[PDB]
């Protein structure tokens, strides 16, 4: 699936 | 209490700008991408890009492309969306929507804002 | 981008009924499609995501299988809070879209 990177 | 609480209604003229915000509350605003989705009256759903709130990195869908942008504000757990160079095809409601974002990709909206009324006329 | 199919665009129903939707897409999205329940007024809810992992909380009366580029939901025993617009998402690749929506209403 699409994804926008590392999160917090 | 996991919820995001979005600006209220707005009116703008065609070419204007308009600029609505969500916040996020019960939750930790930046372990959570976030789209944002739009209903035109009568209408189905169309997602215009997503933000990841800890980078502020965007994908924007490239129908609106350079036309709406997604910024966000960590401090108040703020993201917002302005939609520019406006047209009546761009009546509708619009919300924000976090992702579940299991393994860092997406999975489903599981969290909506209540949505944001934008009228565009003359 | 692509397209995501839903049929019945509108399905009549009984309180009790056992009712089945489908969504169909234009090429494969693996298991990377969810599920919303929409009613007037009000943002939709995710029902399913992972094609047929339910959300939680969300009740054992509903149930989704596929993979590829065919989907269906189920409801087991409709109840009356069930009738409302159900649509399908895919987010394997960009552009993200959404099914254009079954409507399911009450018959009388």
């Known amino acids: 699936a699409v994804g926008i990177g590392a999160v917090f | 209490q996991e919820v995001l609480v979005q600006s209220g209604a707005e009116v703008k003229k065609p070419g204007a700008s308009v600029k609505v915000s969500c916040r996020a509350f019960?939750?930790?605003?930046?372990?959570?991408?976030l789209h944002w989705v739009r209903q035109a009256p009568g209408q189905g759903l169309e997602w215009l890009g997503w933000?990841?709130?800890?980078?502020?990195?965007?994908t924007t869908s490239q129908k609106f492309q350079g036309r709406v942008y997604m910024t966000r504000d960590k401090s108040i757990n703020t993201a917002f969306l302005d939609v520019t160079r406006l047209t009546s095809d761009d009546t509708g409601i619009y919300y924000c929507?976090?992702?579940?974002?299991?393994?860092?990709?997406?999975?489903?909206?599981?969290?909506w804002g209540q949505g944001t009324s934008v009228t565009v006329s003359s | 981008d692509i397209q995501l199919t839903q049929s019945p665009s509108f399905l009549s129903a009984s309180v009790g009924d056992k009712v089945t939707i489908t969504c169909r897409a234009s090429?494969?999205?693996?298991?990377?499609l969810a599920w919303y329940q929409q009613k007037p007024g009000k943002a939709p809810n995710l029902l399913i995501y992972?094609?047929?992992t339910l959300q939680s909380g969300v009740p054992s009366r509903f149930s989704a299988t596929g993979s590829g580029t065919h989907f269906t939901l189920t409801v087991s025993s409709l109840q009356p809070e069930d009738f409302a617009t159900y649509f399908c998402?895919?987010?394997?690749?960009?552009?993200?879209?959404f099914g254009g929506g079954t409507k399911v209403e009450i018959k009388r």
């Open positions: 929507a976090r992702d579940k974002y299991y393994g860092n990709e997406a999975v489903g909206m599981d969290v």
């Open positions: 019960g939750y930790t605003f930046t372990g959570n991408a």
């Open positions: 933000i990841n709130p800890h980078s502020g990195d965007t």
């Open positions: 090429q494969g999205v693996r298991n990377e």
């Open positions: 992972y094609a047929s």
């Open positions: 998402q895919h987010m394997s690749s960009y552009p993200l879209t």
